[model samples]
Target chain A: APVVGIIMGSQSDWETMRHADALLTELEIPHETLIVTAHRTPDRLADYARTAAERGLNVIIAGAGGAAHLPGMCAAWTRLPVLGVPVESRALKGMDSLLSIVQMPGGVPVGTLAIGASGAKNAALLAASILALYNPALAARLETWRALQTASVPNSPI
Target chain B: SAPVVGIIMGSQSDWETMRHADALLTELEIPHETLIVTAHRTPDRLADYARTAAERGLNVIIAGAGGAAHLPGMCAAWTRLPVLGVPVESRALKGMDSLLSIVQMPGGVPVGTLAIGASGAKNAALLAASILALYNPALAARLETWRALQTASVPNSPIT
Candidate 1:
């Protein structure tokens, strides 16, 4: 069963959200990705998020731009922690997307990250970190991943 | 003398946050105008106010709002003057919504953004002062002194 659900507002988001998909694949985490728009397909979102926990989804990473509300709305329906990535918009440059996702109300919290690719990558790593709590194998893989990343850093800037 | 810096907000609810900007500007002795102008409730009022800001002698504008916060973005749309935004903390989202709405302005139009809540409000004022000081020599000296005092007051280590 898929433990992580990666969703985006549209196909355009795949360009940015692919990072999350790739990271999850690299970690050997079972997951699924789909296009789920908050505005155009509100009912679809309601059903998906409502049944997320029962369907075996441990965490969800949602991506959107321009008044982005996919993550917030998803959190509204699911008990699972939702992480958000603000895809950079053409006009606003993802500032709007960032606010829309991150500014979710207190009762419904959506952990948000930076705009574009960095946010998407971090969201995957964050989900792995969460699953690691009860997943010893994943926890081990994650630890090595972190060590590799830390060691890869240059001693000084070029 | 006419005001050079204008600090505006969406509604009376915004005053709590916008006041920080007002207080900082006053502390720095920057002559400024502070008022409530909602982009939604009083659209016409906001339009005229923003459109006439430059001719009336306002140099920089600081706008703060919460909820469906559009005051800062709308203000920047009408006026060519520099607009600084502060995302006020809201009861529901705690200013995350406000921060995104204000900061994510489209290209060609911009609102220099600050952090959320009181810290953002305070910094917007200082930013406006710095902009003004670019032309005003005396204000430049005052801002430099303020900056130096802040640096001097920093502790080398944390309290805890």
Candidate 2:
């Protein structure tokens, strides 16, 4: 069974959310993906979040564009560590997505990252790190992933 | 010079950020007007300003707001004239609320949105001109001057 849950607002979000999946695969952590729209399917979104922990899902990574409140709203309903990735929208670019995802009030805190593909990739690493809290093997794999990430950085800007 | 540009902020507090728009307009020789019109607090004033702007010879409306920044979109909802939005940086989410409120329109009502805080404010003015230049010959001439000035800069005689 998957320990990490990858949820996105739409099939279009896969372009961005793929980075998260790739990072998790590199760390050897099994994860399942789902399409859960807060706007289109509000009831399903709530049910998914409320029962996520009981379903063997430890960490959840949610991605969306435009008024991207899926991740923050989900975090509010569940205790599971949630990481938000703001996929850039076409019209106003990704600014709309970034702001909507990051500006959750004090009660619900969703760890937000940068916009577009980079943000989704980082969300994966962050979600994995959160899951590693209970699993030693997963924790070690996360550290290895981080080490590889740092090592991959070029000496100078490409 | 009558007010060709009308700058409205979400609050008096938005002045700190909106002043950048003023400075840029001043530097550009663009005669403009500015005021605070909160979407939540003073919905009436916000509606009035947007509805009657074109009648007052206002060519552009620059709206800046923080958090749930509904100013630009709401203003656009009233006026067919161009609306440029500035996402004023907020304590929470660094003006993400401002960004979304400005940018995400329901397709028909287009609010040409800019980045957060000073850069966004600066870009709003530029965007306003781009939209206005679509028809006005005088404003089109002004844009030429603006572009020429931008191209004339040599960046301190190139990199040493």
Candidate number of the best TM-score: 1
Cα shift from native, residue B88, model 1 (Å) = 0.7
* Model 2 pairs in collision: A99-B96
Residue pairs of candidate 1 with colliding backbone atoms = A89-A94
Single out the weakest 10-residue window by summed lDDT for candidate 2 chain A.
A100-109
The residue-level lDDT of candidate 1 at B141 comes to: 98
Query: How accurately is candidate 2 docked according to DockQ?
Result: 0.10
Question: Using lDDT as the measure, which candidate wins?
Answer: 1
Worst 10 residues of 1 chain A by lDDT: A99-108
- Comparing to the true complex, what docking class would candidate 2 get? incorrect
Give the TM-scores of the predictions, in the order they appear: 0.54, 0.53
Q: What would the per-residue lDDT of candidate 1 be over residues B2-78, giving only the tens digit for each residue?
A: 79999999778788888999999999999899999875455557768988999999999999877546678667767
Relative to the true interface, what fraction of contacts does candidate 1 keep?
0.14
